[PDB]
């Protein structure tokens, strides 16, 4: 598909598409390719995710949904339509598209077609409305009513397939083919009128049923089982985690670029023991005025260094002019661009790309000369 | 009236039809929509082909909407004659049998939504006449029917449904059901010893 | 699991069992032993077909009479469900008993 | 200006298509 | 047929009419039992999460103050701050579902600030349209394609709708995710969804504990917080390897210099040890040699996840005690007949209730254990 | 502006201090440090009347809280000084008296390792207790370590200190380190100060220590942002290898245990978590740079 490294690099249209709008990427591409000579294929090698992100934006489509139902006409009455809705109507209904392509534009304009379509009985039939003989409809669109009937039979065959015996209702009525009993009352049969023919309410029920079947089937596009379904999962053994445990041993070598005897500690401990019990003079803590100056002199030495560091700890204000600064930024950016591609193949570890390393080296040398 | 338009937004509409094959196709589509998360609503007859053996376990069946008591057609020669025969022979009142006949079908549909004890759903009986029929329901259904739910409203029922569905989604505490609703081999042996 | 009734060993095809199933199975065995008819109503949320097949099939395989079993449903769809449950039990019994005992189970429907 | 940068890109991409083709 | 008026008066005043210390402990004792089960599970410290947020019509409901969209976005900002604090060397991506389409709002990157800006901008737009899990999952699958094999590919989905409209077959996408070894966590809002449960189960080696539904706003914060910790890896999923990264040295220069990452003048930066290029902040992949640069502090932030401190077990009042004051904070233990002492088995030192929470939540080393000389 | 809590983690041990005296020409230098600390704590108490003081001593066989003393007296300080000052100093010196006696009895005991990690962890717990118990108090840590003594192995010290750094950073508790000894820099303690906005200082001579304490480690948490720290050293935030033990600038870390390795471990297996690496993948690192033939 058009989401892999190979196809994305070779898709010229996509690369020009985002680059057309993407300004920051455009600035670097113009400098590092038009004049510097970096091959286009190498430039997009490190920007694969950028290409995929833009493609995915326009490479996805919404799911099927009932569109004619949403269309509510709401003396003058106005109904709002949008191109996205227009495409949805064609996708969810091929009869509308059939009468649209062969008519628009040959006889009249598109706006009249949709006004013609809505006023026609074809729109009512597709929307599920019960057709009323009183309604006049449109003469041109009504010509496709018979054609739509043929598609309905074709769609029924398209949806007709053998069904699993678990939920096969046909077999239940065919379990005994010689059942003879009282016919069900009229409440348990499709409605009929005085003349005896169908009232037509069954047709809309099939139409909505057909719409759902087509929508579900469209999902399964080109892009043992009963054993598990009937199993009682609640009675089976509870799921058990299979996480791996780890034990960390702590033993590392020491960092690499007179010992006091036991009695000495006791001897020294006694000295502090006596020096503490006998008396304690806090006033002796004051320096002698000869080391305080040295202590202060070295402490400030760090203060001055720290103060200089911290006084300069969005972009910082600069002294260079805008023209020179912009040129310097471009030179820094183009040199950095060459550095990345050079390291990818220089550190690739495959001798196949030796020529690229030599070629990438040349531009780096030119950067030194340019700098 | 435009009511179906609102339903189309949230769920696909599948309707039972007289043709057995078409109804079977609707069931397959209805199950597919439930499995894939699209959501579907199935409209069927309480005394139809779907209610006589098709079960809606787990995701397929989460809410049962019983629109009225599935009463037979009273003004039927066949039914009236049978009612009189039972009244004279078995001393069964005509009203009692009619209530029994309708309730069994309503309960039949209610029981097609639970497979194991981890399955859950909401069963709503929408008719003023179900209020006094609590004693006529199956014992395991009558037990779950609380007194406060004998007569509810659409708004009140919806609030309970939302609260009930949220609670059922929480992880069940195993210790609350180790040996009170599900038994292991050791638990069963304990039951045998205690009884004996 | 494989638990014991008063004298009938029954092999349940699941490691766990509901309290209702054991009570349901116990009542069915008493009806068969004492003879006659019974009406047992059990909630739909508890495995009923598996419990019926487990006890009844164990009952014939153990007692000398080896009484056969007749299962009656209301539709063809239920026949397949029972048969799938029937296949589940025999597969478990075959694995636990170490051999495939002589057992035949078939469904009967129309030519169509 | 962006327009000038677009034209040279179009000419450059046109050259790429001409070169690759 | 008399009404309720004639029956009687409610008499509300009739309704109201006019060991405890042990209760407060037994609850504490029971709660310690829940956390007693702690083992050194192997966890993937390096993570690559794709945060998927639902922004649809169902998110306009008033269940959560002020509305689901605002609260979820508000918690999303909080999640980013907490996630990167405890997972410095991980990367995050943000996706949203709008108009039945998946919209990218943040590319996979290790800079927390960039994600915060994107979330704040999303806080303004009004959500609408239908959600699409397949569109979001497919986009998440692509975003995680350019990720090393040693990282853990994860997707956190905040779902608010009860229905999903997709252009293709969702089950195929689920199968692809399992093949790609991506792990999906779903935080639903209203009720369980059949497809979501399958996605969370089949994608996590059958575990059903990764599909959580909240019960109130307080619980939602707990659900979001729980996702910050690394997710334990499966035994049979082995991806052990060595990753080449360096430790740069900070500099302090007198004059500004251009940065190799943003081409912007910055006073101070960290010099890469492989190509000497400077980077403004860490942890980030070097823009030149594609070598990850981190400090020793970043690695140390994850040690507690590999060597968790063993829980502290209560001490029964039957036995005698060592000291009347806490070992770490010397907070006198109230006499109260029950004891509040918590002892560490490794060092057998009493700890107060206050420290025990602090030691196992803020700190990660037992004060008594370190003091003890072998 | 607001009261601040000062917790001094003094590491006192005859082995650490005896070596300091032997190498130098000062005998009983612990008194000079102890005397300076008494005045330093009094100076902190003089800054505000609502600030508290805590001292934790890390002795050879464990840690002990010098102040405040546990609920469970000799005359060493004049009784004519300020009451609050003496109330702390007198208890501080008395505990030193008891602690030395306890240490003297167990002199023959084998002090396998230092206990600085526990005291720092203990100090943080005390800081948390006061902050929540009293409600709006700032906190600070001060570590007085004697590095003259030749340490046996400092690797164990790395993990506890790093965990303490994160806790201090979260609670906004800057930690300052004052080191007296031979080694100029401590790779771990110095790292702790920088990562927590603390002050690291090293002094070779014990005499005149108060000037350092009152001029460098006297920055209260209220005015930390407006005072430039006097630290002079620089930190690289690097860690030693697990086999060579040297500082690694560019190396490899295990994916599972995050153990730094300067070179590929022998046997193509991790030496810390016993994890086997893929032969092909490790070969990728072993590949040499690409050059034209
Ligand atoms: Zn930068
Ligand atoms: Zn680099
Ligand atoms: Zn405590
Ligand atoms: Zn301990
Ligand atoms: Zn390892």
Min Cα–Cα distance to chain C from A215, Å: 27
E169 interfacial to chain B (CB closer than 8 Å): yes
Question: Taking a C-beta distance cutoff of 8 angstroms, is the pair B82, B74 a contact?
Answer: no
In the block, residue with structure tokens 């102890």: F34
Residue count (chain A): 371
What is the F256 CA–ligand 3 centroid distance (Å)? 34
Spell out which residues have Cβ within 5 A of ligand 3, the ion. E 326, 328-329, 331, 352, 355
Q: d(Cα E142, Cα A52) in Å, to the nearest integer?
A: 8
Burial of residue C10 (CB within 10 Å: 0-12, 13-18, 19+) is: buried
The secondary element (H helix, E strand) that includes residue F54 is: strand F53-59
SS3 for F272?
coil
Here the tokens at position B123 are 């069963």
The secondary element (H helix, E strand) that includes residue C61 is: helix C49-62
Min Cα–Cα distance to chain A from E31, Å: 23
Largest CA distance in chain B: 65
Residue C45 is labelled as binding a ligand: yes
Min Cα–Cα distance to chain D from A30, Å: 8
D8 interfacial to chain A (CB closer than 8 Å): yes
Question: Taking a C-beta distance cutoff of 8 angstroms, is the pair B79, B18 a contact?
Answer: no
Regarding chains E and C, contact by 3 or more CB pairs under 8 A is answered as: no
DSSP track, A140-190: HHHTTHHHHHHHHHHHHHHH-----GGG-HHHHHTSSTT---PPPPGGGS-
What is the E263 CA–ligand 2 centroid distance (Å)? 15
In the 3-class helix/strand/coil scheme, how is chain E assigned residue by residue?
Answer: CCCHHHHCCCCHHHHCCCCHHHHHHHHHHHHHHHCCCCCCECECCCEEEEEEEECCHHHHCCCCCCCHHHHHHHHHHHHHHHHHHHCCCCEEEEEEEECCEEEEEEEEECCHHHHHHHHHHHCCCCCCCCCCHHHHHHHHHHHCCCCCCCCEEEEEEEECCCCCCCCCCHHHHHHHHHHHCCEEEEEECCCCCHHHHHHHHHCCCCCCCCEEECCCHHHHHHHHHHCCCCCECECCCCCCCEEEEECCEECCCCCCEECCCCCCEECCCEECCCCCCEECCCCEECCCCCCEECCHHHHHCCHHHHCCCCCCEECCCCCCCCCCCCCCCCCCCCCCCCCCCEECCCCCCEECHHHHHHHHHCCCCCHHHHHCCC
SS3 for A270?
helix
Give buried/exposed letters for E85-115 (b at 16+ CB in 10 A, else e): ebbbbbbbbbbbbbebbbbbbbbbebbeeeb
Question: What's phi and psi for A121, nearest 5 deg?
Answer: -75, -20
Q: d(Cα C76, Cα B49) in Å, to the nearest integer?
A: 12
DSSP track, D1-21: -HHHHHHHHHHHHHHHHHHH-
The secondary element (H helix, E strand) that includes residue C3 is: strand C2-4
B150 interfacial to chain A (CB closer than 8 Å): no
A227/C77 Cβ within 8 A:
no
What is the A329 CA–ligand 1 centroid distance (Å)? 12
SS3 for F77?
coil
Ligand at minimal distance from the CA of E354 is 3
What is the E368 CA–ligand 4 centroid distance (Å)? 5
F211 interfacial to chain A (CB closer than 8 Å): yes
Ligand at minimal distance from the CA of E369 is 4
> Is the backbone peptide bond immediately before F68 cis, with ω within 30 degrees of 0?
yes
SS3 for B126?
strand
SS3 for B161?
helix
Chain mean position to CA F207? 21
Region of F274 (left: φ > 0; alpha: ψ -120 to 50; beta: rest) is left
| DSSP code at position B169 | T
Residue numbers in B near E190 (CB within 8 A): 162, 165-166
Domains delineated in chain B: 1-176 (3.40.50.300)
Q: d(Cα A327, Cα A126) in Å, to the nearest integer?
A: 64
Regarding chains F and B, contact by 3 or more CB pairs under 8 A is answered as: no
What is the A359 CA–ligand 2 centroid distance (Å)? 21
Regarding chains B and D, contact by 3 or more CB pairs under 8 A is answered as: no
What is the E278 CA–ligand 1 centroid distance (Å)? 8
Q: d(Cα A168, Cα C110) in Å, to the nearest integer?
A: 14
Min Cα–Cα distance to chain B from C2, Å: 8
Spell out which residues have Cβ within 5 A of ligand 4, the ion. E 344, 346-347, 366, 368-369
Among the partner-chain residues A60, A63, A336, the one whose CB lies closest to the CB of E260 is A336
Here the tokens at position B105 are 């079908």
D13/A16 Cβ within 8 A:
yes
A153 interfacial to chain D (CB closer than 8 Å): no
- Method of determination? cryo-EM
E41/A60 Cβ within 8 A:
no
Hey, CA dihedral for B169, B173, B174, B176, is it positive or negative?
negative
A281 interfacial to chain B (CB closer than 8 Å): no
Q: d(Cα A20, Cα A29) in Å, to the nearest integer?
A: 11
Question: Taking a C-beta distance cutoff of 8 angstroms, is the pair E271, E278 a contact?
Answer: yes
Q: d(Cα A169, Cα B34) in Å, to the nearest integer?
A: 19
Here the tokens at position B132 are 């006094």
Q: d(Cα B191, Cα A204) in Å, to the nearest integer?
A: 58
What is the E245 CA–ligand 2 centroid distance (Å)? 10
Write out residues 206-265 of A within 8 Å (CB-CB) of B: 206, 208-209, 212-213, 215-216, 219, 232-235, 238
Burial of residue E315 (CB within 10 Å: 0-12, 13-18, 19+) is: middle
Min Cα–Cα distance to chain A from D3, Å: 10
SS3 for A197?
coil
Among the partner-chain residues A167, A176, A230, the one whose CB lies closest to the CB of C84 is A230
Q: d(Cα B117, Cα F221) in Å, to the nearest integer?
A: 61
| DSSP code at position B87 | H
Residue C42 is labelled as binding a ligand: yes
Residue C47 is labelled as binding a ligand: yes
Q: Which long-range contacts (CB under 8 A, 24 or more apart) does A69-72 make?
A: A69/A127, A69/A128, A69/B4, A69/B5, A69/B8, A70/B5, A71/A118, A71/A127, A72/B2, A72/B5
Here the tokens at position F249 are 């600038």
Min Cα–Cα distance to chain E from A90, Å: 15
What dihedral angle (degrees, nearest 10) is formed by the CA atoms of B138, B141, B143, B147? -110
Question: Taking a C-beta distance cutoff of 8 angstroms, is the pair E297, F162 a contact?
Answer: yes
**Resolution (Å) of this entry:** 3.2
Domains delineated in chain F: 4-217 (3.40.50.410)
Question: Taking a C-beta distance cutoff of 8 angstroms, is the pair B16, B48 a contact?
Answer: yes
Residues 6+ apart with CB under 8 A from E304: E364, F163
For chain C, the C-alpha Rg in angstroms (whole number) is: 14
The secondary element (H helix, E strand) that includes residue C93 is: helix C76-97
Among the partner-chain residues B8, B31, B45, the one whose CB lies closest to the CB of A69 is B8
DSSP track, C5-51: -SS-EEE-SSS-B-HHHHHHHHHHHHHHHH-S-------TTS--HHH
Here the tokens at position E215 are 């019960």
Residues paired with B64 in a beta bridge: B123
Residue C43 is labelled as binding a ligand: yes
Question: Taking a C-beta distance cutoff of 8 angstroms, is the pair F94, E336 a contact?
Answer: no
DSSP track, A229-268: HTS-STTSPPP---BPB-------PPP---PPPHHHHHHH
A60/E288 Cβ within 8 A:
no
Min Cα–Cα distance to chain B from A195, Å: 21
Question: Taking a C-beta distance cutoff of 8 angstroms, is the pair E99, E129 a contact?
Answer: yes
């Amino acid at each position: 598909d058009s989401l892999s490294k190979e196809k994305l690099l070779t898709n010229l249209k996509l690369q020009q598409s985002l680059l057309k709008g993407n300004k920051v990427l455009m600035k670097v591409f113009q400098e590092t390719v038009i004049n510097a000579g970096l091959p286009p294929s190498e430039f997009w090698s490190t920007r694969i995710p950028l290409l995929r992100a833009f493609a995915l934006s326009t490479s996805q489509k919404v799911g099927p949904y009932n569109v004619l139902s949403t269309i509510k006409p709401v003396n003058k009455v106005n109904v709002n339509l949008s191109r996205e809705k227009i495409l949805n109507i064609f996708e969810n209904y091929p009869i509308v598209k059939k009468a649209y392509t062969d008519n628009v534009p040959k006889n009249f304009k598109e706006p009249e077609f949709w006004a013609r379509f809505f006023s026609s009985k074809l729109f009512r039939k597709l929307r599920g409305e019960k057709i009323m003989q009183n309604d006049r409809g449109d003469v041109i669109i009504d010509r496709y009513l018979t054609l739509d009937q043929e598609f309905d039979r074709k769609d029924d065959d398209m949806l007709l397939h053998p069904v699993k015996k678990i939920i096969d209702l046909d077999g239940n009525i065919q379990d005994d083919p010689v059942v003879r009993g009282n016919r069900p009352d009229f409440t348990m049969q499709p409605g009929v009128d005085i003349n005896g023919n169908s009232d037509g309410t069954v047709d809309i029920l099939k139409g909505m049923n057909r719409l759902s079947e087509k929508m579900i089937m469209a999902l399964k596009n080109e892009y043992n089982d009963e054993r598990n379904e009937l199993k009682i999962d609640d009675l089976n053994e509870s799921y058990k985690t299979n996480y791996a445990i780890i034990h960390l041993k702590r033993n590392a070598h020491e960092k690499t670029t007179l010992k006091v005897s036991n009695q000495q500690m006791l001897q020294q401990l006694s000295l502090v023991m006596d020096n503490l019990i006998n008396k304690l003079d806090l006033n002796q803590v004051v320096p002698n005025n000869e080391v305080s100056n040295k202590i202060n002199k070295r402490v400030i030495t760090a203060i001055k260094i720290n103060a200089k560091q911290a006084k300069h700890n969005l972009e910082v204000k600069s002294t260079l002019p805008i023209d020179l600064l912009e040129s310097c930024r471009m030179l820094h950016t183009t040199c950095c661009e060459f550095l990345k591609h050079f390291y990818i193949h220089f550190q690739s570890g495959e001798q196949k790309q030796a020529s690229t390393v030599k070629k990438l080296y040349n531009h780096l040398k030119d950067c030194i000369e340019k700098l | 009236m435009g009511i179906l338009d609102e339903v189309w937004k949230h769920k696909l509409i599948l309707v039972e039809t007289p043709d057995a094959q078409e109804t079977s196709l609707a069931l397959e589509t209805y199950r597919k929509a439930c499995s894939n998360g699209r959501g579907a609503i199935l409209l069927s007859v309480a005394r139809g082909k779907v209610s006589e053996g098709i079960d809606f376990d787990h995701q397929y069946g989460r809410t049962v909407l019983m629109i009225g008591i599935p009463f037979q057609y009273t003004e039927s020669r066949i039914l009236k004659a049978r009612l009189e025969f039972m009244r004279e022979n078995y001393r069964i009142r005509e009203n009692d049998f009619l209530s029994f006949d309708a309730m069994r079908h309503a309960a039949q549909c209610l029981g097609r939504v639970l497979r194991g004890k981890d399955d859950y759903g909401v069963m709503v009986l929408a008719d003023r006449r179900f209020s006094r029929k609590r004693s006529q329901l199956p014992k395991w259904i009558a037990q779950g029917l609380s007194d406060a739910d004998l007569n509810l409203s659409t708004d009140m029922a919806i609030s309970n449904t939302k609260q009930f569905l949220r609670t059922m989604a929480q992880p069940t505490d195993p210790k609350d059901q180790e040996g009170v609703s599900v038994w292991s081999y050791e638990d069963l042996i304990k039951h045998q010893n205690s009884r004996k | 699991m494989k638990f014991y009734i008063d004298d009938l060993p029954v092999l349940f095809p699941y490691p766990k069992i509901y309290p209702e199933q054991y009570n349901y199975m116990c009542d069915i065995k008493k009806t068969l032993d004492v003879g006659g008819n019974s009406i047992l109503e059990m909630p739909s949320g508890t495995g009923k077909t598996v419990s019926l097949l487990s006890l009844t099939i164990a009952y014939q395989m153990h007692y000398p009479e080896h009484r056969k079993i007749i299962y009656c449903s209301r539709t063809m769809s239920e026949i397949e469900k029972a048969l799938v449950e029937l296949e589940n039990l025999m597969d478990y019994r075959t694995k636990e008993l170490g051999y495939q005992e002589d057992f035949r189970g078939l469904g009967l429907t129309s030519r169509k | 200006e962006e327009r000038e940068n677009e034209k040279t890109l179009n000419d450059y991409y046109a050259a790429l298509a001409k070169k690759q083709a | 047929g008399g009404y309720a008026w004639e029956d009687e008066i409610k008499r509300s005043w009739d309704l109201v009419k006019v060991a405890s210390l042990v209760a407060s402990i037994v609850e504490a004792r029971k709660k310690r039992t829940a956390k007693k089960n702690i083992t050194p599970y192997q966890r993937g410290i390096i993570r690559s999460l794709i945060l998927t947020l639902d922004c649809s019509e169902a998110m306009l409901e008033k269940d959560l103050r002020p509305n689901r969209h605002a609260m979820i976005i508000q918690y999303a900002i909080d999640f980013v701050h907490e996630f990167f604090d405890q997972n410095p060397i991980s990367q995050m991506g943000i996706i949203i579902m709008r108009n039945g389409l998946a919209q990218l709002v943040s590319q996979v990157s290790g800079n927390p600030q960039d994600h915060i800006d994107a979330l704040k901008s999303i806080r303004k737009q009004e959500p609408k349209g239908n959600p699409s899990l397949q569109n979001a999952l497919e986009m998440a699958r692509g975003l995680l394609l350019p990720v090393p094999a040693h990282c853990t590919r994860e997707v956190l989905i905040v779902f608010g709708s009860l229905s999903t409209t997709d252009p293709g077959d969702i089950h195929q996408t689920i199968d692809s995710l399992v093949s790609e070894k991506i792990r999906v966590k779903v935080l639903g809002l209203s009720a369980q969804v059949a497809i979501c449960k399958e996605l969370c189960k089949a994608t996590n080696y059958g575990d059903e504990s990764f599909y959580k539904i909240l019960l109130d706003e307080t619980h939602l914060k707990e659900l979001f917080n729980e996702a910050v910790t690394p997710l334990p890896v499966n035994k049979i999923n082995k991806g052990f390897t060595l990753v080449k990264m360096g430790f740069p040295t900070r500099i302090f220069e007198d004059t500004p210099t251009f940065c190799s990452c943003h081409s912007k003048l910055v006073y101070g930066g960290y010099f890469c040890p492989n190509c000497h290029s400077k980077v403004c902040s860490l942890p980030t992949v070097c823009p030149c040699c594609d070598l990850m640069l981190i400090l020793s502090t970043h690695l140390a932030r994850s040690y507690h996840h590999l060597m968790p401190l063993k829980t502290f077990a209560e001490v029964p009042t039957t036995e005698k005690f060592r000291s009347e004051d806490c070992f770490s904070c010397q907070s006198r233990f109230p006499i109260l007949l029950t004891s509040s002492r918590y002892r560490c088995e490794d060092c057998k030192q009493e700890f107060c209730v206050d420290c025990d929470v602090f030691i196992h939540e803020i700190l990660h080393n037992c004060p008594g254990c370190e003091s003890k000389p072998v | 502006e607001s009261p601040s809590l000062l917790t001094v983690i003094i590491e006192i041990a005859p082995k650490l201090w005896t070596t300091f005296d032997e190498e130098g020409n000062e005998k009983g230098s612990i008194i000079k440090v102890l005397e300076a600390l008494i005045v330093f704590l009094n100076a902190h108490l003089a800054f505000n009347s609502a600030n508290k003081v805590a001292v934790i001593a890390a002795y050879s066989q464990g840690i002990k809280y010098l102040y405040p003393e546990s609920t469970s007296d000799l005359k060493i300080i004049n009784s004519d000084m300020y009451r609050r000052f003496r109330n702390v100093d007198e208890t501080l010196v008395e505990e030193i008296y008891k602690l030395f006696e306890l240490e003297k009895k167990q002199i023959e005991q084998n002090s396998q390792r230092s206990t600085l990690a526990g005291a720092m962890s203990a100090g943080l717990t005390y800081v948390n207790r006061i902050s929540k118990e009293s409600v709006s108090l700032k906190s600070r840590l001060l570590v007085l370590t004697c590095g003259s003594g030749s340490s046996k192995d400092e690797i164990f010290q790395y993990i506890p200190i790093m965990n303490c750094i994160f806790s201090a950073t979260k609670m906004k508790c800057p930690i300052d380190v004052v080191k007296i000894g031979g080694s100029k820099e401590s790779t771990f303690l110095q790292q702790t100060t920088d990562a927590t906005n603390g002050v690291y200082l090293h002094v070779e001579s014990t005499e005149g220590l108060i000037q350092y304490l009152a001029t460098a480690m006297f920055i209260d948490p209220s005015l930390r942002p407006i005072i430039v720290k006097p630290n002079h050293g620089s930190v690289d935030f690097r860690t030693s290898c697990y086999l060579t033990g040297r500082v690694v600038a560019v190396g490899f870390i295990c994916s599972v245990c995050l153990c730094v390795l300067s070179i590929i471990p022998p046997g193509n297996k991790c030496p810390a978590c016993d994890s086997q690496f893929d032969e092909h993948v490790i070969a990728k690192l072993k590949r040499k740079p690409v050059v034209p033939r």
